[PDB]
Amino acid sequence: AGMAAAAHVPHTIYSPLFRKFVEWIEYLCLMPIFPLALWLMNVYAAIRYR
Amino acid sequence: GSGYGLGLSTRTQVTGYQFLARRTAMALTRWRVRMEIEPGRRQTLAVVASVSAALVICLGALLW
């Protein structure tokens, strides 16, 4: 799927509303990392059962 | 050049594009572009209001 996209994306046109949408995917990905890492470390359960 | 690829874009350009689209969508159905009143948006917000009202009842039920 990557090779397909690498070959087609450089020669097509996209309207501003989609370009603005692909940008926000990055920020939506960064935000959940910390809340999830602490869950995996059991921090929320440890404190609630201090 | 020519706007190829996925380059970044300004918020002024986003509404700019979205305006040309609404005007063209009106041309296909009403065959005119004077647009004294814009029924396209008014009809769309009524759907968004219905979807939002449905989700609010779910939060109420979930909270219960």
Curated annotation (Swiss-Prot), chain A:
Part of the ESX-5 / type VII secretion system (T7SS), which is composed of cytosolic and membrane components. The ESX-5 membrane complex is composed of EccB5, EccC5, EccD5 and EccE5. It comes from the Bacteria. This is ESX-5 secretion system protein EccD5. Belongs to the EccD/Snm4 family. The chain crosses the membrane at residues 27-47. It comes from Mycobacterium tuberculosis (strain ATCC 25618 / H37Rv). Was identified as a high-confidence drug target. Part of the ESX-5 specialized secretion system, which is responsible for the secretion of EsxN and a number of PE_PGRS and PPE proteins, including PPE41. It is found in: Cell inner membrane. Disruption phenotype: Mutants are defective in the secretion of EsxN, PPE41 and PE_PGRS proteins. Mutant is highly sensitive to detergents and hydrophilic antibiotics such as ampicillin, vancomycin and bacitracin. Virulence is attenuated both in macrophages and in the severe combined immune-deficient mouse infection model.
Swiss-Prot record, chain B:
Part of the eccB5-eccC5 operon, which is essential for in vitro growth. An ATPase (shown for residues 80-506). Part of the ESX-5 specialized secretion system, which is responsible for the secretion of EsxN and a number of PE_PGRS and PPE proteins, including PPE41. Residues 1-46 are cytoplasmic. It is found in: Cell inner membrane. This is ESX-5 secretion system ATPase EccB5. Belongs to the EccB family. The lineage of its organism: Bacteria, Bacillati, Actinomycetota, Actinomycetes, Mycobacteriales. The chain crosses the membrane at residues 47-64. Part of the ESX-5 / type VII secretion system (T7SS), which is composed of cytosolic and membrane components. The ESX-5 membrane complex is composed of EccB5, EccC5, EccD5 and EccE5.
